[PDB]
Design a protein around this ligand. Structure first.
Ligand code: FMN
Ligand code: MG
Length: 169
């Protein structure tokens, strides 16, 4: 199995499109993509480095497929693993709940032993509140393909460089 397991959910495809950009950005072929509508909870056991991708749905909720997997995470042993988070979200439509989902996921996985890496500055986003907030920073990369599509490629470039360091790749 490849070094990095990237587990994403999507309804309208934008999280999946970002996921593929992230995979490519690593340059070297070190990522396997998993759609969580199709994946099993035990697939996470296969990787030391995890990337978790999730948009926020229904105003502050986990994406439906990630909702399903989340209820199965209380058993999984994340101890010693390193975990990064990315989300797509809409900071103009949902200013009070922007990227809530990666914060919900990170709260759960960090409690199970998985160490968060790849925190991301909140600079250049216009939002009011977020469960992904971690003191000046989001728990992971915030993408917005609704409002800031023109910023996605450069944000991914910069974030992947950071993760490569954290994963020692
Ligand atoms: C009804 C609905 C509610 C949403 N609520 C939020 C929200 O609470 N926070 C947020 O950041 N984005 C919210 N969004 C925007 C989506 O998260 C954003 O469009 C995301 O890219 C969709 O991902 P997908 O195309 O992979 O399904 C909402 C979108 C819809 C249609
Ligand atoms: Mg405990």
């Amino acid at each position: 199995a490849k070094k990095i397991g990237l587990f994403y959910g999507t309804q309208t495809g934008k999280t999946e499109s970002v996921a593929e950009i992230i995979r490519d950005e690593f340059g070297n072929d070190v990522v396997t993509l998993h759609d969580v509508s199709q994946a099993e909870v035990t697939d996470l056991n296969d990787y030391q480095y995890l990337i978790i991708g999730c948009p926020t749905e229904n105003i502050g909720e986990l994406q439906s497929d990630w909702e399903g997997l989340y209820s199965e995470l209380d058993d999984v042993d994340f101890n010693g693993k390193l975990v990064a988070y990315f989300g797509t979200g809409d900071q103009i439509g949902y200013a009070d709940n922007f990227q809530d989902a990666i914060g919900i996921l990170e709260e759960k996985i960090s409690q199970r032993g998985g160490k968060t890496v790849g925190y991301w500055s909140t600079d250049g986003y216009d939002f009011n509140d977020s469960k992904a907030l971690r003191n000046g920073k989001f728990v992971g990369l915030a993408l917005d393909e609704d409002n800031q599509s023109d910023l996605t490629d450069d944000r991914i470039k910069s974030w992947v460089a950071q993760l490569k360091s954290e994963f020692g790749l």
